[PDB]
Amino acid sequence: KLPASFDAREQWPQCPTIKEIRDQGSCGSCWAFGAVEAISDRICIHTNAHVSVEVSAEDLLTCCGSMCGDGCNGGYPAEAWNFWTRKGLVSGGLYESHVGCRPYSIPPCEHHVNGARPPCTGEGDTPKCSKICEPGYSPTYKQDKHYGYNSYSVSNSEKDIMAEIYKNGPVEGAFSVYSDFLLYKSGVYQHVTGEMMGGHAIRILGWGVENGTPYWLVANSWNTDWGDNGFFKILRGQDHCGIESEVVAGIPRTD
Ligand SMILES: *C(=O)N[C@@H](CC1CCCCC1)C(=O)N[C@@H](Cc1ccccc1)C(=O)O
């Protein structure tokens, strides 16, 4: 019996990563962000909050290589979670956090919104794969790796995606972004106007209903001044913009 609403932040309240919004910077690395965010969450869930770490977007973005795609010029979720199963991922927090083994090297920026940071730009290079932790971090790069037991596609089924989240925690998904999506502030996003911009990868962490509209609860990787504090809701139940068609997840190995 699935509940009418579910929010992973409410189910697993000693897992702060689920609460967190990252900033992919001037880099098309959302494929990597949705993966390491959901993986961070699932490690904390899998251990009852005994292990709570920011998994390194840098390590996945820079060290996966051609298996995952083309780094900052785009990649795909399914191979991101496969990489976690094969080579694992070290820890790493936000730009200049000094959190973990490999904190993200690309500065934060303004994503389709006004604020104090520089506006995000295109054409950024993928940073180099560096298999060493920031000076003074313990343990070693190799010792800090977290591995996946498995990786898998979730079927294009609303109730299967809900059950997956409900049992195992947040997932990665991808959908088609039309230009009206860029100006999202609140409520349940449905495509009403604008042309296709491209595919986008995100973290799905729950569901609900607002004013009779069923939705998914989704985290973007565009900082907290984008959207609804960095989150959005998107129409659920109709494979809207492909939101149910590209869902990926995986079960962590106990460290
Ligand atoms: C994942 O990284 N997705 C990127 C492309 C999406 C395609 C559909 C339009 C929305 C974006 C993305 O999120 N890009 C970021 C960062 C960026 C900014 C400017 C130039 C290149 C990359 C974005 O904020 O759009």
Numbering used by the authors: 0 to 254
How is this structure described in the published paper?
Cathepsin B shows endopeptidase and exopeptidase activity, an uncommon dual functionality among the cathepsins. A special structural feature, the occluding loop, covers the primed binding region in the closed conformation of the enzyme and confers a dipeptidyl carboxypeptidase activity to cathepsin B. The two protonated histidine residues (His110 and His111) of the occluding loop interact with the C‐terminal carboxylate of exopeptidase substrates, and of epoxide‐ or nitrile‐based inhibitors. In this study, we developed peptidomimetics with an inversely oriented warhead that undergoes deprotonation by the active‐site thiolate as the key step for the covalent inactivation of the cysteine protease cathepsin B. Cathepsin B has been validated as an effective cancer and inflammatory biomarker and a promising drug target.
With Pro in P2′ position, Leu in P1′ was slightly more advantageous than Cha (8 versus 12), but Phe in P2′ gave a better combination with Cha than with Leu in P1′ (7 versus 4). The most suitable dipeptide sequences were disclosed as Cha‐Phe, Chg‐Phe, and Cha‐Pip (7, 6, and 13). Two representatives were subjected to crystallization and the crystal structures of human cathepsin B in complex with the type A carbamate 7 and the optimized inhibitor 31 were determined at a resolution of 1.45 Å and 1.70 Å, respectively. Noteworthy, since 7 and 31 contain the same carbamoylating substructure, the complexes are highly similar with an RMSD of 0.12 and 0.09 Å for alignment of inhibitor atoms and protein Cα atoms, respectively. Hence, the different N‐terminal substructures influenced the non‐covalent binding event, but not the accommodation of the covalently attached dipeptide portion. The latter is held in place through a network of hydrogen bonds and hydrophobic interactions mainly with the side chains of Val176, Leu181, Met196, His199, Trp221, and His110, His111, which compose the S1′ and S2′ subsites, respectively. The N‐terminal CO‐NH segment is hydrogen bonded to all three residues involved in catalysis, including Cys29 and Gln23 (in S1) and His199 (in S1′). The imidazole nitrogens of His110 and His111 interact with the properly positioned carboxylate, similarly as in case of CA‐030. Our inhibitors with inversely oriented warheads behave as suicide substrates, undergo cleavage and effectuate the fixation of their dipeptide portion in the primed binding region of the protease.
